Design a protein around this ligand. Structure first.
Ligand SMILES: *[C@@H]1O[C@H](CO)[C@@H](O[C@@H]2O[C@H](CO)[C@@H](O[C@@H]3O[C@H](CO[C@H]4O[C@H](CO)[C@@H](O)[C@H](O)[C@@H]4O)[C@@H](O)[C@H](O[C@H]4O[C@H](CO)[C@@H](O)[C@H](O)[C@@H]4O)[C@@H]3O)[C@H](O)[C@H]2NC(C)=O)[C@H](O)[C@H]1NC(C)=O
Ligand SMILES: *[C@@H]1O[C@H](CO)[C@@H](O[C@@H]2O[C@H](CO)[C@@H](O[C@@H]3O[C@H](CO[C@H]4O[C@H](CO)[C@@H](O)[C@H](O)[C@@H]4O)[C@@H](O)[C@H](O[C@H]4O[C@H](CO)[C@@H](O)[C@H](O)[C@@H]4O)[C@@H]3O)[C@H](O)[C@H]2NC(C)=O)[C@H](O)[C@H]1NC(C)=O
Lengths: 356, 356
């Protein structure tokens, strides 16, 4: 089942929810990858301190092996994140920009009831050079109270990051441009008798004179207008992310003018295709992941799997004991635990103290 | 001279420029601080490799001293950046959100000329139960072509990050809320003769019959209306950032409903007060900055200024020679330069190779 989330966009408010939810999904992908990097850098500082506290040459080289491995994979992953990060943030920014746009248009398109001003009566005058009576209104306004989008339980279940993996997204749905550009209104004129410039009784927000002027054109001669409603109807449109063959993004820029929906579809397509690679979590590393890691062959040689097990352990249970558990369990004292210490104000000073 | 930039905001387009320029200023402050951290972390990896390549105990401890110093100040600065980062990004996001809002409202407020539809003639009908003639229009619209903000040389000189240091900012200027909420229009009705439901000649986008219907109410009986212009005038408003005493932010939330301008002023105030502390640049460190650094007293003792000069040099010229120049000049070979190598895919492997 593809396009669960986009297929739930049927209104300005649900497009706003989709756009903000997808932007947050891209932002969270980046935050998760950067958190993984930060955890890895914290583990490298932890092993650096443990290396300095070792008195055994072979245990020292073991910590060195983990430091080298962690630096390699984490520096690489940080460099490889930058492209996908920029692509995903470009889309997140555009999606947030669009959601802001739609919400501002929603507020104006809610201004659906007019307040008339007191008119001024005339005879012929532009744009009615042939009239004998005119009734001129200046500064009619329409304003709505503060609007807000209300979402149901199902809106939040369907338009949800859980349904925004790249494998299920093939299109976006957007509100038509006229909602963002066009004022629409109905209006009606009414006449009775022989309205002229002397129809200057304005108590009913129209032009009356003669007889007994009052409600419902009470007077002999009357002219007026009313703006009976305003507001442009929202419509929805679909835009595909991919070409017909499904690999390539469909709406690449630089080929001629594009509509907002096409620019957004292109950015979303590129952000979906820009997959992030997260490196191994050093702080929860297992023995098998370490000796299976392609990078440890050249590292272990420099400092093969048989050798790695002799350095790091025959079971993961003792690998955990010797190399993982100390980060949160080994207490360091001088004048905190390892990993907290090496992410603290005294991190460098703990290292200097123990290398002497 | 305070408020050069805000005092140049006199139009929706210049408020948009101010809001986007200030958001970019906050974002650039964060990017600059994070670049400084990344440079420092790169220097720490560089000295780590040089430590591994040293055969001399005292030169090894010297590199260790720089590693410990760099870890201390850079980890601390990274932790201290997080609060100010969040505060500045909260303001940048809000400013961008506002600029999006204003730009969307600008497009709609540019829709200032109406297109009439063909009316339908009637007799009495709501909301003119007392009329003898009515002329009813449905779906009158107004749309503008695509609007764009054009800025002069001086607009870009005055509304500029160069004028957005916290010491010179005391207020923000914003467009009044009615620009974002209210449709405004003028309209006029015209009548001639005795218009009724038989005034059904619509060729002039009004209701005519009798005689020779045509331009300018050519016919005997005529009724019509025109919407002669639309668009709400932008006004500007000032909001102070600080209380009267000047220390505290003026528009703290949680004290009752606030207007957009007050929420923005509060965020800007907090972002201005959230100063970033950037640590020393390790890659351009001088001897005097090192031995003067408060952190090096406990570090040098562990591994006093007299001792530091004996370890790092009597002049900065030899400190540069021994500890700074090698990062970009010392070539490392095995089967690149130091600093590039230790930020490369082979960073960890270079370290492992040389510690053996
Ligand atoms: C860019 O333009 C958009 C569109 O105009 C603006 O979006 C509006 O922003 C305002 C302020 O955030 C929104 O108003 C807020 O709505 C919240 C939810 O409203 C409903 O739901 C609550 C229950 O959750 C009901 O109680 C309520 O009756 C509604 O049914 C309210 O909870 C907020 O209230 C808080 O602030 C107000 C005003 O300060 C106080 O009076 C309240 O006591 C309380 O403190 C608030 O009303 C509005 O809904 C948004 N509109 C849309 C269409 O999204 C952006 O603000 C604007 N951005 C910038 C930066 O300019
Ligand atoms: C949220 O809502 C806002 C407000 O509506 C939208 O902002 C508009 O965005 C569009 C598209 O970016 C802007 O249109 C662009 O304007 C550029 C500058 O226009 C002028 O200056 C150039 C010279 O620099 C003159 O040649 C030109 O005549 C104008 O005087 C143009 O350079 C852009 O042209 C490019 O795209 C168009 C359309 O695809 C092509 O036809 C062109 O050939 C060229 O490829 C473009 O016209 C518009 O100005 C913005 N309006 C405002 C008020 O800021 C946001 O787009 C919207 N955001 C989202 C994400 O929904």
């Amino acid at each position: 089942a593809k396009d669960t989330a986009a297929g739930h966009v049927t209104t300005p408010c649900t497009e706003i929810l989709f756009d903000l939810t997808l932007a947050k999904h891209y932002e969270n992908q980046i935050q998760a990858a950067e958190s993984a990097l930060n955890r890895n850098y914290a583990a490298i500082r932890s092993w650096t301190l443990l290396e300095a506290m070792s008195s055994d040459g072979n245990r020292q080289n073991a910590y060195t092996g983990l430091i080298a491995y962690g630096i390699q994979i984490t520096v690489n992953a940080e460099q490889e994140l930058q492209g996908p990060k920029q692509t995903k943030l470009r889309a997140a920014a555009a999606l947030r920009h669009r959601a802001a746009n739609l919400s501002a248009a929603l507020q104006i398109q809610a201004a659906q009831q007019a307040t008339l001003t007191k008119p001024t009566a005339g005879g012929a005058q532009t744009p009615f050079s042939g009239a004998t009576g005119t009734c001129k209104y200046e500064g009619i306004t329409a304003t709505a109270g503060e609007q807000s989008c209300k979402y149901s339980t199902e809106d939040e279940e369907k338009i949800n990051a859980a349904h925004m993996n790249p494998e299920v997204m093939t299109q976006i749905t957007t509100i038509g441009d006229k909602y963002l550009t066009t004022i629409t209104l109905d209006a009606i004129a009414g006449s009775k008798g022989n309205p002229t410039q002397s129809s200057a009784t304005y108590a009913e927000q129209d032009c009356q004179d003669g007889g007994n002027p009052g409600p419902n054109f009470g007077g002999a001669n009357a002219l007026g207008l009313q703006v009976t409603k305003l507001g442009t109807k929202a419509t929805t449109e679909k835009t595909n992310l991919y070409t017909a063959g499904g690999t390539e993004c469909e709406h690449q820029p630089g080929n001629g003018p594009q509509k907002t929906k096409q620019r957004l579809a292109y950015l979303v397509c590129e952000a979906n295709k820009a997959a992030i690679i997260t490196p191994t979590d050093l702080q929860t590393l297992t023995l098998d992941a370490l000796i299976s890691a392609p990078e440890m062959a050249a590292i272990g040689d420099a400092l093969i799997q048989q050798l790695l097990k002799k350095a790091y352990g025959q079971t993961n249970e003792q690998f955990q004991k010797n190399f993982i558990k100390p980060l949160a369990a080994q207490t360091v004292k001088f004048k905190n635990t390892v990993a907290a210490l090496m992410s603290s104000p005294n991190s460098g000073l703990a290292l200097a103290y123990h290398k002497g």
